[PDB]
Design a protein around this ligand. Sequence first.
Ligand SMILES: OC[C@H]1O[C@H](O)[C@H](O)[C@@H](O)[C@@H]1O
Ligand SMILES: [Ca+2]
Length: 586
Amino acid sequence: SSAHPETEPKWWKEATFYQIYPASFKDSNDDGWGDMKGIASKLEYIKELGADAIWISPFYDSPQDDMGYDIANYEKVWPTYGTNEDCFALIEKTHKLGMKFITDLVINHCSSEHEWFKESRSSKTNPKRDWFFWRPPKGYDAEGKPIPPNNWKSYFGGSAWTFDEKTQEFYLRLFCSTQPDLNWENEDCRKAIYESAVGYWLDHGVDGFRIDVGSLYSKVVGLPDAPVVDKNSTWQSSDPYTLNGPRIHEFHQEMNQFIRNRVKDGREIMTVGAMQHASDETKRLYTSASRHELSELFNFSHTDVGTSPLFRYNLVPFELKDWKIALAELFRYINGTDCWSTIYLENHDQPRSITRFGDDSPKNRVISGKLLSVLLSALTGTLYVYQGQELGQINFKNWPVEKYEDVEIRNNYNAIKEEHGENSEEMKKFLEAIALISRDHARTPMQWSREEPNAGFSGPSAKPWFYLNDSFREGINVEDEIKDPNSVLNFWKEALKFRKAHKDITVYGYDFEFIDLDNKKLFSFTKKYNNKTLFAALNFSSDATDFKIPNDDSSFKLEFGNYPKKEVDASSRTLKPWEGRIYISE
Ligand SMILES: OC[C@H]1O[C@H](O)[C@H](O)[C@@H](O)[C@@H]1O
Ligand SMILES: [Ca+2]
């Protein structure tokens, strides 16, 4: 383990994080929106699951045009969630339970309702004009409408610019129309961002930050028209000019130094960057401890599988190997370095992992949910569990498009309508995809009980902010799963206990090697830690599947799996349907 600097322990390397989506976790006052008192009341549940830390999605004052990711004030809790004091009390309660607390740092962009933008947009001459990206129209079209400065596509569809009538210029918004991008080229802007979004929260005791689209802060000068890579789209991905831009490391080093100098009590701060995509070299530049940038990052290749590179909402075929390789992108690069990795399958931007990567049928949803838990329990990196993942939550079914809340759905729908027609092949493909891929599959209220109609998320008379998934009626809820010894919840409790007990090789294991990489059913690998060897054999299929242990002898003992502990023949070399096994040799 000496030629493996990545094995140096840190609280944040071996912490299991639980991600809370505040709108959808727990309502304490029957207004249909989750809130901080709700979260506080459920911290014991999170601790009992086995979590070491929580990440709460944005709870700051926000119009909710992107459900919190459009922030109007970094220093004020959205009143519907509570007061600032409620938040400080929540941080303290988390701490007093022996858990760490990270907050979501959303500083590529802010709300157009933020005072910075209200000032910026007020004239062309004000001190904050250049805190955002303002450009004149490229020209005017044949109908007299202003043409945006370039061809860039919003992450939510359509143009990445919005026209301001008052000042007669467009402003850049990679996200929704009310999320203007902050101009990191402006040093005064960067310093104000650090003070408000970072310093305030450090002063109030956070243990770290999850950094929203942290790879987007550096725009290539001139904001040039992007390559026309999609021949059936008006607008084009800005990635070459916005993703991992030339100043991105400079900016992350500066922010890291700010954090180091602002902390008052010497505590260890974790940063996890949602960096989206990066070469292995770029990943190392971000997460090498000696670089003083990020602690770790999320890379999205494993959650991209089965979606077109040109458009997330066009489905494409994939095979198990594609997912194996994409998952391994998270962690293989750290081998023999001072870098660190993340491990996750779900977040508030993703559909449910059982639906995507298991089998959500009534027959297989439990066993395949447990299989995914076996996989994640054994992988190197900081593990994240998303609210409801531990219950084996699945995608919702048969929802009409108008039922979806997500601005990502609404804006993409409207762009397709405009470009291709509502009754088009392009629309049909989109509607097919949303049923599998929409962020909204993550966002239906948390299911605490079988109680009609709100599943214990709120009282029975409340109208939830977003519809319940019918799955609560099918036993996917906290109360029913606690009482079922065979539940996905009780299994996740076991998986986290197993991971912690064997943390040297589960959390810090190295020299990851695939076994039978091409296999369309078997996901198998080994890892090392000094004298120890971990071997995984995981059957992602309803068919029985054979496996071999490389250098198989007598030392390989079965330490964890999803089939009944007393019924499994450890010497057998065929996995049952959806069976997973972790063997450890010493
Ligand atoms: O902040 C803009 C977007 O950034 C990331 O994708 C966030 O995780 C997502 O929820 C948000 O819509
Ligand atoms: Ca509420």
